[PDB]
Amino acid sequence: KAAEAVVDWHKHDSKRMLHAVYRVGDLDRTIKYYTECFGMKLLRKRDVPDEKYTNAFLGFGPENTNFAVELTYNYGVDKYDIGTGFGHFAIANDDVYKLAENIKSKGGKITREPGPVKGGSTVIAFAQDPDGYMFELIQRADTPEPLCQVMLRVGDLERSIKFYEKALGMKLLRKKDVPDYKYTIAMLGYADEDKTTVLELTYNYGVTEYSKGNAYAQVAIGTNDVYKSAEAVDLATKELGGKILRQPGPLPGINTKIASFVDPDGWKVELVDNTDFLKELH
Ligand SMILES: N[C@@H](CCC(=O)N[C@@H](CS)C(=O)NCC(=O)O)C(=O)O
Numbered sequence: 001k002a003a004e005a006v007v008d009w010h011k012h013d014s015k016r017m018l019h020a021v022y023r024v025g026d027l028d029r030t031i032k033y034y035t036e037c038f039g040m041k042l043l044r045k046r047d048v049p050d051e052k053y054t055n056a057f058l059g060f061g062p063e064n065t066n067f068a069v070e071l072t073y074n075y076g077v078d079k080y081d082i083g084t085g086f087g088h089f090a091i092a093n094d095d096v097y098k099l100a101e102n103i104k105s106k107g108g109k110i111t112r113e114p115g116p117v118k119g120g121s122t123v124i125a126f127a128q129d130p131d132g133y134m135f136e137l138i139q140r141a142d143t144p145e146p147l148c149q150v151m152l153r154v155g156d157l158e159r160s161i162k163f164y165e166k167a168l169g170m171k172l173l174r175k176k177d178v179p180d181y182k183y184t185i186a187m188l189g190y191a192d193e194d195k196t197t198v199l200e201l202t203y204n205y206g207v208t209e210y211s212k213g214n215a216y217a218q219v220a221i222g223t224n225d226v227y228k229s230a231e232a233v234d235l236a237t238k239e240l241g242g243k244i245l246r247q248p249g250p251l252p253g254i255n256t257k258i259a260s261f262v263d264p265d266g267w268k269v270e271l272v273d274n275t276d277f278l279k280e281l282h
C-alpha cells in the first residue's frame with residue numbers, strides 16, 4: 001500500500017546531496033587548507049554570536065548547483081573526536097599527481113601517495129586535513145562535481161543498502177567485495193557516480209559497530225517535500241532500524257522546512273526543502 005506510494009514519491013522527487021556538516025578546531029586554518037591545498041572556493045561565511053559559533057561553506061561551485069562542506073567552529077573548542085566510523089570525503093580531479101604535489105607544496109599532509117587502488121586500477125591518493133579528516137583524491141576526467149563522496153563505515157552493508165534505497169530513494173550505483181583486504185563497499189546516490197556526490201558505505205569483515213565521534217555532524221539532502229520524504233524514512237525505519245529525530249516542519253520563525261533522522265548505524269541525515277534551502281545562499 002504505502003510501499004507503492006513511497007516508490008512513486010521517490011520517482012517523482014528531485015533529491016540532491018547538499019552538504020556535509022562537520023566541526024573544526026580552527027576555522028581560518030581549515031579555510032586556508034581547503035582553498036590552497038584542495039582548490040576549493042570559500043562560498044559563504046557566517047558568524048553566529050548568539051549561539052556561539054561561526055560557519056563557513058566551501059566547494060567547487062555555488063551551493064544551489066553543487067555539494068559543499070559546511071564547517072562549524074564552536075568558540076573556544078579546538079579539537080573533536082573523529083571516531084572510528086567516519087571514512088573520508090573525496091575530491092575528484094583530472095590529475096591526482098598534480099594535486100598531491102600541490103598539497104605537499106602548500107604544506108599539507110599526503111598519507112597515501114598517488115597510484116592505482118590496491119587490486120584495482122583507479123589512481124587515488126589520500127590527504128589528511130588539520131583536524132584529522134581524511135580526504136581521498138580520485139583521478140577522474142571531467143566531472144560536474146569534484147566533491148564527490150562522503151564515505152561512512154557501517155555494520156551490515158546489505159541492511160544499509162536497503163535502508164538508503166527505501167528511506168531515501170537512492171540508487172545502488174556500485175557494490176564491490178574486496179576479499180583480499182576483507183572489506184566490501186557500496187556507492188549510493190541520485191545520478192551516475194562520476195557525475196555526482198555519492199554516499200560510499202564500507203563494511204569491514206566481522207566489524208559491526210563504530211564510534212560516531214563528535215566531529216562529523218550530518219549530511220543534508222534536498223527534497224521537493226520534506227513531509228513526503230520523511231514518511232518514506234519513517235516506513236524504512238520501522239523495517240530496518242534508524243529513528244526520526246526531528247519530524248518534518250518549518251523552523252521557528254524562518255519557515256524553512258526540514259526533517260532529520262539517523263540511519264541503522266546512527267549516522268545523521270537532514271532533509272531540507274529544495275526551495276527553502278535557497279533562502280540562505282547569499
Ligand atoms: N579498512 C578500510 C577498508 C576500505 C578500504 O581500504 N578502501 C580502499 C579504497 S576503496 C582504500 O582505502 N585503500 C587503500 C589503498 O588503496 O592503499 C576502511 O574501513 O577504510
Ligand SMILES: [Co+2]
Pocket residue numbers: 088090136149151200
Ligand atoms: Co572513497
